[PDB]
Design a protein around this ligand. Structure first.
Ligand code: KAI
Ligand code: KAI
Ligand code: CL
Ligand code: CL
Ligand code: CL
Ligand code: CL
Ligand code: K
Ligand code: K
Ligand code: K
Lengths: 254, 254
């Protein structure tokens, strides 16, 4: 039987294709994650229907300890796989089963070019430049949970003033960086995509942590280990590298 | 609840401690993997008995598909865990389980500073500078199996002349780079360790792939998922980073 794949629109992972007529079904979508799913299908031999997660969230826990987003779809067995830039984290791995990573990344800083700011510590030791993250994403959670002094200082700042420094989504964060004196704490692979397309933006510093994106499955799924082996095949043959090059390349920035 | 741990001597992961008297048991060893095992045992609450793998190998298949090394120890249920710089690969994932990675790396090139060589394609297009890898290791297997034209070229060269360009172990490769006109294809984390200590050597180019080290267990082990959760905890608290800095940092280079 056909697997249900939960996902979420996020450039360049999953995007609506451009067409002069209304689109239906899997034909609605293109992107790195659709290519990955096509290759995982080619290897494992399953059919699949792609379904956008109905609440438009990745997966976080609230105050009752209730999950939402793609994580919840898997928990409830309303999806077989989640194929998205879903960060592999301690809290999520307790509740679902991720494949080994198809991409490796870290938190870093998106800001304007031409400034003297060079690191997270440069941000933390000042208050003039505002900085934040996407509310309730894994980057925000990293800062909330950190016991490293610099990151504690940064969390105090972000969470201050009813979290006015946080943004609802990455596009809001990018526009805030482009318009105002603001730096966004963002996953490095998204920074790479953005800076290839807006030439006034740059990554500040290196990666402050290390983590991966993996395919999510419900706990106990037999697909998890089969997908890990397929991912390793695609990596070792250079296919993942080719797919990243295809979707990230921008041709307009120095 | 004492787990049997198979491992292998490899700087700075597992080393003999220095003492004026003979050492016994787990007290024989120190290094990043011993620190990791201490942290995992604190989180998960197990005792452990460390045993060097009797044949002194990581794990590779022969012609008949038979395995050796730490991988074979796990297959035969002679150990509960393998804790070492054991690269997570397609062929090993078919026969053992691994935790998610505690370190992420790629193949790169170890060579001398101040030469014209900038990339693997610089090596592939010539025959004057010899280059190779540790025989039967994951790096050699990467080249053997690659269909990328550059890496096929490189494999043809490495395997020529009864594999004269290959070496038996990393220390042999390091001495050959120091003495002769030779470049070693080596996992990037080992290159970092080496170049901290040999100021006339450098990494050439970037990473030509992406992979991790994981804790190995027999297929079906319940510890694999528990160890993954412990590793993510250690990563997110910044402990893995601190552990790397502790074992890697050298005395500085002029
Ligand atoms: C696009 C966003 C909301 C997602 C992508 N990965 C992270 C996640 O899976 O939580 C989030 C980004 C972040 O928190 O920087
Ligand atoms: C130290 C060596 C022989 C090991 C370490 N990881 C690789 C493995 O697990 O196969 C080998 C290195 C390599 O192949 O470059
Ligand atoms: Cl069309
Ligand atoms: Cl849908
Ligand atoms: Cl021993
Ligand atoms: Cl896993
Ligand atoms: K249209
Ligand atoms: K899990
Ligand atoms: K496996």
């Amino acid at each position: 039987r056909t697997l249900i794949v939960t996902t979420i629109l996020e450039e360049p992972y999953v995007m609506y294709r451009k067409s002069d007529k209304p689109l239906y079904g899997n034909d609605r979508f293109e992107g790195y994650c659709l290519d990955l799913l096509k290759e995982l299908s080619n290897i494992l031999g399953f059919l699949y229907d792609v379904k956008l997660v109905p609440d438009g969230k990745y997966g976080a826990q609230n105050d009752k300890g209730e999950w939402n987003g793609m994580v919840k779809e898997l928990i409830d067995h309303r999806a077989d796989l989640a194929v998205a830039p879903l960060t592999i984290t301690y809290v999520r791995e307790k509740v679902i089963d991720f494949s080994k990573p198809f991409m490796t990344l870290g938190i870093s800083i998106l800001y304007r070019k031409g400034t003297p700011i060079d690191s997270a510590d440069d941000l933390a030791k000042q208050t003039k430049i505002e900085y934040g993250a996407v509310r309730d994403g894994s980057t925000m959670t990293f800062f909330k949970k950190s016991k490293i002094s610099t990151y504690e200082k940064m969390w105090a700042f972000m969470s201050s003033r009813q979290q006015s420094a946080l943004v609802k989504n990455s596009d809001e964060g990018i526009q805030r960086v482009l318009t105002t004196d603001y730096a966004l704490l963002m996953e490095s692979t998204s920074i790479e995509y953005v800076t290839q397309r807006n030439c006034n933006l740059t990554q500040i510093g290196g990666l402050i942590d290390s983590k991966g994106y993996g395919v999510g499955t419900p706990i106990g799924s037999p697909y998890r280990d089969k997908i890990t082996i397929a991912i390793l095949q695609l990596q070792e043959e250079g296919k993942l590298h080719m797919m990243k090059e295809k979707w990230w390349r921008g041709n307009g920035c120095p």
